[PDB]
């Protein structure tokens, strides 16, 4: 749970420049296997706006909008395009808990107090705690914003999923 606290402080420190707010997640056997959880190297996230444009690219478009050319010597705008694409991903902190646990009981074993509307227990073989940043530049955030989650393992393989802001925030934002 230290990862969530540190990430909250870090995002608070960076909010003036980044305009990204923190989002705390828990992962278990429903998203990754035990081996994948034991060998995880990095977690990366990307912000995508309502128009399908990634945050890290130029607002007015790029040379990348042009069609590809089938020329091996050109690759696909090779080095410059590779640099532009890599630039849009951002790295997040994470910690792995490799043994079966009950989440609420674990949180109460730490210093946290827990008070839910319904206190149903949730049991998981393992847990990965990570925090992702969601971008809100205008101090407004649109429900159509999309967020991507990437997990990377030592051999360089990766797995991607994407989420849209409505599912993440519908009742939570309406509550505030």
């Amino acid at each position: 749970m230290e990862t969530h606290l540190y990430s909250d402080l870090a995002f608070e420190a960076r909010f003036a420049d980044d305009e990204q707010l923190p989002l705390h997640l828990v992962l278990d056997q429903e998203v990754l296997s035990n081996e994948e959880a034991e060998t995880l190297r990095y977690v990366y996230y990307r912000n995508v706006d309502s128009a399908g444009r990634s945050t890290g690219r130029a607002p007015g478009g790029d040379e990348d909008d042009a069609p590809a050319s089938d020329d091996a010597e050109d690759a696909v705008g090779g080095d410059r395009a590779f640099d532009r694409e890599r630039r849009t991903w951002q790295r997040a902190c994470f910690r792995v808990l490799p043994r079966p646990l009950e989440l609420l009981d674990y949180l109460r074993q730490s210093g946290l107090t827990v008070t839910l509307e319904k206190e149903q227990r949730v049991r998981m073989f393992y847990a990965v705690f990570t925090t992702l940043g969601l971008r809100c530049p205008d101090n407004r955030l649109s429900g159509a914003q999309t967020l991507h989650l990437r997990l990377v393992w030592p051999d360089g393989s990766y797995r991607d999923w994407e989420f849209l802001a409505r599912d993440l925030l519908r009742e939570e934002m309406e509550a505030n």
């Binding site: 909250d8 705390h24 399908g52 690759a75 395009a81 205008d138 999309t146």
Partner: protein, 295 residues
């Protein structure tokens, strides 16, 4: 004395626990909300106008189609070149054949195989695996170097007699990826790795297992195979080694879409990695539940 942020973070605690699925409903994860997050103090506005969601869904649809449009491009190219040459196709892979065979039924089996491959092709097909290394950064420079080596003029006697070694050409054995479709019991194997070399006596292609054994599915009548080379040349081969040859064009897609869909990842320095590049890695820094933690 003052109070630390960690103490109030602990005492304030959480009050939320919610399950969120991804857009395609493949994966479910839980979100925790802390009542002491700085998220609370901001003056935040939120709105979900319908047209923005509609546009977002259209963009998401566009993101998914990138692989399937490429597969369809390969298929319609196959049909176009087949129409262009009037259905007459030459042997390109080494295999012995007999004039007494009823080639009409193997034509019919080829048609069935085309239908089945189009039914089963996926993101893990040989096309995507073959083009993915092209997106790596070293790829463009390597292609420039290969072209400059390929077309240099013949050495004069001086350079043969004096100075450096002769510049080595490309290796004779190549690495290809293939999609294998079997009809008799419907089964398609996508993205299989194969080694291709050209026979000396006749300039045909010979394909081998990565362990060196000969791949034998030219001899099996019920299977057709699609090969893709790193130069993005593809062969659609029906048994007997007779093939349909064309190039995998991809100018129907923007650079951004292909690139951001499946550009390869590149690592950053972390625990256990040598600071020098290319060194032999030590053991992987696993964190495990079988053992006591090292501390």
């Amino acid at each position: 004395d003052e109070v630390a942020r960690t103490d109030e973070w602990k005492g304030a605690g959480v009050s939320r626990l919610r399950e969120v699925w991804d857009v395609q409903h493949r994966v479910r994860l839980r979100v925790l909300w802390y009542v002491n997050s700085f998220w609370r103090s901001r003056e935040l506005s939120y709105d979900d106008h319908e047209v923005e969601l509609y546009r977002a869904l259209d963009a998401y649809r566009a993101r998914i189609a990138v692989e399937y449009v490429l597969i369809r491009a390969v298929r319609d190219e196959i049909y176009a070149v087949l129409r262009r040459d009037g259905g007459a196709l030459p042997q390109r892979f080494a295999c012995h054949v007999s004039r007494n065979m009823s080639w009409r039924v193997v034509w019919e089996l080829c048609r069935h195989a085309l239908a089945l491959w189009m039914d089963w092709a996926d993101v893990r097909s040989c096309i995507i695996k073959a083009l993915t290394p092209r997106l790596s950064r070293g790829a463009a420079a390597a292609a420039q170097r290969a072209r400059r080596q390929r077309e240099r003029s013949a050495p004069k006697p001086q350079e043969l007699l004096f100075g450096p070694r002769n510049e080595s050409g490309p290796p004779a054995e190549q690495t290809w990826y293939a999609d294998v479709v079997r009809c008799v019991r419907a089964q398609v194997d996508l993205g299989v790795e194969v080694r291709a070399a050209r026979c000396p006596r006749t300039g045909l292609w010979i394909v081998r297992d990565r362990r060196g054994r000969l791949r034998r599915w030219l001899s099996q009548p019920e299977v057709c195979v699609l090969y893709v080379t790193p130069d993005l040349d593809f062969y659609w081969v029906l048994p007997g080694g007779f093939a349909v040859s064309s190039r995998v064009t991809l100018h129907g897609l923007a650079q951004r879409a292909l690139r951001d869909r499946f550009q390869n990842f590149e690592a950053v320095l972390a625990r256990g990695m040598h600071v020098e590049a290319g060194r032999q890695e030590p053991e992987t820094p696993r964190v495990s539940g079988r053992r006591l933690p090292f501390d």
